[PDB]
Symmetry: C3
């Protein structure tokens, strides 16, 4: 919500309260999953060719006790400041989205699941700390519909090596016309010494790229995505040496509020030390959201797992149904 708008500064205070329950035979995917979000987004007119901005956003879990587990799963998601230069681009620095998510985002539209290859603290695939990002939308006022980005990532040496990284760079590009769109992105970075002493994954470089296509118009959404990761997909005991990742989704928006969705996700891991080849994501998803208005909604999401019992990286293979009730402002 815009709660301040005066003398060239605007300030949005936004958030949501999400009542949420999972039903599944798995232990870790069953029970209460309620949570809340809070953030600000501000914008200030400096002159005719320059505008400054900033944003912060946090996750408050609603399924902890008020005792020793109170802080579990709570965290800042975004935190950055930047400058917008008229037609000539934007630059911002802080905790933000990696450029490979410009591609991975196109199938990340399910009511509760989806988006499985874009994760936090994972080089360029999701939200990461220490990113410097330049974007130019509409290509300096001449080739509109054509968007481009370039990004630098500074080293983060963390106690948890699966959430660490060394220096890297990324780039992305997308074009839209008449409801059709296409996008691609590539990034690469150094791995840290601690990442190279883990049980899975060998190599000096982490690389991620993905590419995709969509039609998004006339109440219709379709998109398909393919990509690959080297020494970069995060697994339970380290990183996969290489992966092949694919997803696809189809949705329609009825005028009276309902929006059904069907999707399929499959990813295969390759040359895991002592294990070989094996699927690490594989499921069909069917669900729907009902929008009462722009502030209230409800949903059901049904994840139909198609991994098997002899899964050889030990990944769980049960189903889940999710039921959600959302108030947002």
């Amino acid at each position: 919500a815009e709660i301040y708008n005066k003398d060239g500064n605007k300030l949005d205070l936004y958030g949501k309260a999400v009542g949420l329950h999972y039903f599944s035979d798995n232990d870790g995917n069953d029970g209460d999953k309620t949570y809340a979000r809070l953030g600000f987004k501000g914008e200030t007119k400096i002159n005719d060719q320059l505008t400054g901005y900033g944003q912060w956003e946090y996750n408050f879990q609603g399924n902890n006790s008020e005792g020793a587990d109170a802080q579990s799963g709570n965290k800042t998601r975004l935190a950055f400041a930047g400058l917008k230069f008229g037609d000539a681009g934007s630059f911002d620095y802080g905790r933000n989205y990696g450029l490979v998510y410009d591609a991975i985002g196109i199938t990340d539209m399910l009511p509760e699941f989806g988006g499985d290859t874009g994760v936090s603290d994972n080089f360029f695939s999701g939200r990461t700390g220490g990113l410097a990002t330049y974007r130019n939308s509409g290509f300096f006022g001449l080739v509109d519909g054509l968007n481009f980005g370039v990004q630098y990532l500074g080293k983060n040496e963390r106690t948890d090596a699966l959430r660490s990284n060394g220096d890297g760079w990324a780039t992305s590009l997308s074009y839209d016309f008449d409801g059709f769109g296409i996008v691609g992105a590539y990034g690469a970075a150094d791995r840290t010494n601690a990442q190279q002493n883990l049980q899975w994954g060998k190599g000096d470089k982490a690389e991620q790229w993905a590419t995709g296509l969509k039609y998004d118009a006339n109440n219709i959404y379709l998109a398909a995505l393919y990509g690959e990761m080297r020494n970069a997909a995060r697994l339970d005991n380290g990183f996969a040496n290489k992966t092949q990742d694919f997803s696809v989704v189809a949705q329609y928006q009825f005028d009276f509020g309902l929006r059904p969705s069907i999707a399929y996700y499959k990813s295969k891991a390759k040359d895991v030390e002592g294990i070989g080849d094996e699927d690490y994501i594989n499921y069909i998803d069917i669900g729907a959201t009902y929008y009462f208005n722009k502030n209230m909604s409800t949903y059901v999401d049904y994840q139909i797992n198609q991994l098997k019992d002899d899964n050889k990286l030990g990944i769980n293979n049960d189903d889940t149904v999710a039921v959600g009730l959302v108030y947002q402002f």
Copy 2:
């Protein structure tokens, strides 16, 4: 404070800053006790028979250092979303108040102490996670003043068994007219396997109920409460097998802002393994609040303990004086 109200959505951002000091021999009840609260509460008109809503609230302690103890005592208190269907009731889901607090609340009006049998993560007696709640005010438009609710609780398997529960149900009912009110509530739920392995308390089911009466008019507040808990009152080393719980309060509001208060609290535990019967709450309370206006107040509260020296359940038995200065919005 209402900070936004536009096109059918309203958003109240509320909170307070409480400067607070305890005087006592206890040690765990003697230093600085300063804290702050922040929350939002929102409401959106969907159509003439349907409003959506959501609420979140958090506690930030003000008596920690900025070092390693910085997070001690910090937590989410409330987090839920719901739908109100005109006269046919309301439904919300998340972290909210258990229905037995509909009765326990009537003597929870002291300046600093009081409310001792209604606590967090304690089945239905206070704030608990995973509550699905139905309420109906005014009985479908037919009986003005008459309220009831029905509530389901999903199990919470936590590392701390004293803050856990299994599945359960609860219900409540109250009537008000001409300044008088009356209320009762009952709930029951399964206990977890770990709750059945603690040194105090044995049994498969936990039960809580309480009932009360009040007069609230002409600057006068009086109320009395009686109830009992089975395998559900939390003690130092587990749960009491049975309890008998009683409290009573009397207050008067002078026109120039001062509001004195006196109360008495007595609770008895029965058949504790290796101990037998013994009081676990027993005290007299004297205090006063002075309201400067609806945003500012100050108070003193004097708790006069009557538990016995070196008692057999190990409960501390000292007095405490509390002094507070409160800014709220």
Copy 3:
């Protein structure tokens, strides 16, 4: 930002997002330093002689992962409530600034570094919990420009002895006239039982004082500060028995937004068990801020260390450069 102003109550919601990066050969001062701040400050008119107020403020680090280190370095900075009595002063209680920071603050104007002797949970040099503070500005309306304060500090017995204190008191005084100002302040406190068993610093009593003056007008800022601490300057392994502390700074504000700065800081610790005398702070600082307007700015700060590589307290001696981009509201 002022977001509510109605019937005598107003509420300011304020904060900032700071993208910040450090460059240095010291590994503990290198990489991402992004963070964000959020707070409220409210005020309520009671009558012609009486205003209530309250404030809370929090620090959210932006350079943690979303995993197990998420809460690292996050904390409440301020939390207090108070009363303003027209001309005859103010009183507040909670977590606030100690009165010796009335003096130390005059050189705490660098873009990033500086302010080294005023720190959190350090008796009266910075922000501390449990402070009762009385101030009188303008000396009852009689002696204009002349400010006075007196303060009581309650005991904080914490697990970390380096962030503890016993009971104490402080006082300060300042005068301004014609762009010139002068200030001095003194406080003294008991030390806790555990503080007296550390490797460095002995005595059952702590003391702090500082004094300084400034010229602040016609786009010029100049100021110098000197003070001393007994059993109160916090070092790595306890407290220095005595210190001599000095700082000085000079700044000019150009009309088009630029503000360069130079400063020099030197503090010497004296009579350290097994060490004798040794410097614990020593550097030259050059930097500048560019203000785009009152909501957006950018800065570079260059810390030129002049401690020696064989320092007897083992304090690191490399240089650091900080670059920052700041949005605030």
